[PDB]
Amino acid sequence: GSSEGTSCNSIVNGCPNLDFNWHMDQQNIMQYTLDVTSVSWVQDNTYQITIHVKGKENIDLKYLWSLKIIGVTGPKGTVQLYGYNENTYLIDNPTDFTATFEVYATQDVNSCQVWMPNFQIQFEYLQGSAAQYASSWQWGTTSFDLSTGCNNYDNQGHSQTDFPGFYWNIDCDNNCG
Ligand code: NA
Ligand code: NA
Ligand code: NA
Ligand code: NA
Ligand code: NA
Ligand code: NA
Numbered sequence: 001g002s003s004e005g006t007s008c009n010s011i012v013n014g015c016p017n018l019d020f021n022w023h024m025d026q027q028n029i030m031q032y033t034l035d036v037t038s039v040s041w042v043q044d045n046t047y048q049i050t051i052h053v054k055g056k057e058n059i060d061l062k063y064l065w066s067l068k069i070i071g072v073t074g075p076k077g078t079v080q081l082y083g084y085n086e087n088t089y090l091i092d093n094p095t096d097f098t099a100t101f102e103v104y105a106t107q108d109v110n111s112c113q114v115w116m117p118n119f120q121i122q123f124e125y126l127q128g129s130a131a132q133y134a135s136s137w138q139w140g141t142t143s144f145d146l147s148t149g150c151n152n153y154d155n156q157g158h159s160q161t162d163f164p165g166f167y168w169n170i171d172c173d174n175n176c177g
Contacts (some may be wrong), residue, residue, distance in 0.1 A: 005040035005048065006172040014115065014165045015150035022158040028140040031056040033152070034148065034163035037098070041172035045106045046075070051123065053121065055095030059139055064094045065127035070145070073117035074103040084128060094123065111169045112176035116166045118149040 013035075024031050038050045066086075069079035079101045080088040105114040125142040126134050138165035150165035169176050 003043065005042065006173040008039040008041070008047075008117065008168040009174045011036050011039050011166060011168050012113075014109070014167050015159070016164060017155075017157070018150070018153055019157055020157040020159045020162055020164065023160055023162050024146070027144065029144050029146070029162075030059075030139040032095070032146055032162065034121075034146075036166045036168075039168045039172065042102065045104050045120070046102055047105055047168070047172070048100060048102050049116070050098055050100045053096075055139075057095065057139060058093070059095045061092055061094065062131055063125045063133050063137060065124040065130045066122070067091065067094055067097075067124070068122050069099060069101065069119055070122050071119045071147075072101065072103060073119075074101065088172050094125070107167070108170075112169055112173075113167045114170050115150075116148070118147065118151075118161070118165060118166075120145045120147045145169065 010058055021031050032053055033057045035052045037052050040048045042048055065080055066083040067081040072079060080086050081091050081099055082088060103117050105116055107115045109115055122145045126137055146162040148163045148165055149161040152160040154160060
């Protein structure tokens with residue numbers, strides 16, 4: 001049985017004035033960005049969201065061993081994006097990719113809007129058969145997790161996450177308020 005999605009009009013970066021770059025720089029991780037490009041209410045407090053992740057420089061797919069979204073509060077806690085072990089090949093560029101998955105978004109920003117539940121993206125470069133390309137690797141730390149959120153920052157405006165948190169309208173009711 002199918003249902004009509006309800007698209008959210010306003011998807012808000014909840015903390016655009018934090019310095020996220022610092023947290024990747026401190027770990028010698030190349031800078032990445034994340035945007036939430038669409039949100040649709042499915043039913044209950046479940047939303048289908050699409051993310052777009054970009055790296056500062058282009059890293060060829062050959063360097064990648066695995067990529068997965070972890071720590072997801074949703075129907076699936078893990079969303080495999082790439083991995084030989086898991087026969088999963090759902091992205092072609094670890095430095096410019098999209099993913100669509102479901103989350104349960106329940107923590108209120110206000111009476112009309114809820115926060116995205118935060119998650120991490122686990123990158124493994126140069127492992128397994130990708131280790132053969134080590135000599136041309138030039139982008140710093142090779143295995144790392146990048147986290148989302150607006151709730152973890154130092155006393156000088158640096159985030160201790162790598163990507164902003166986001167919020168949107170409850171049930172994607174664009175007429176709330
Ligand atoms: Na709609
Ligand atoms: Na979506
Ligand atoms: Na998966
Ligand atoms: Na809040
Ligand atoms: Na409020
Ligand atoms: Na201090």
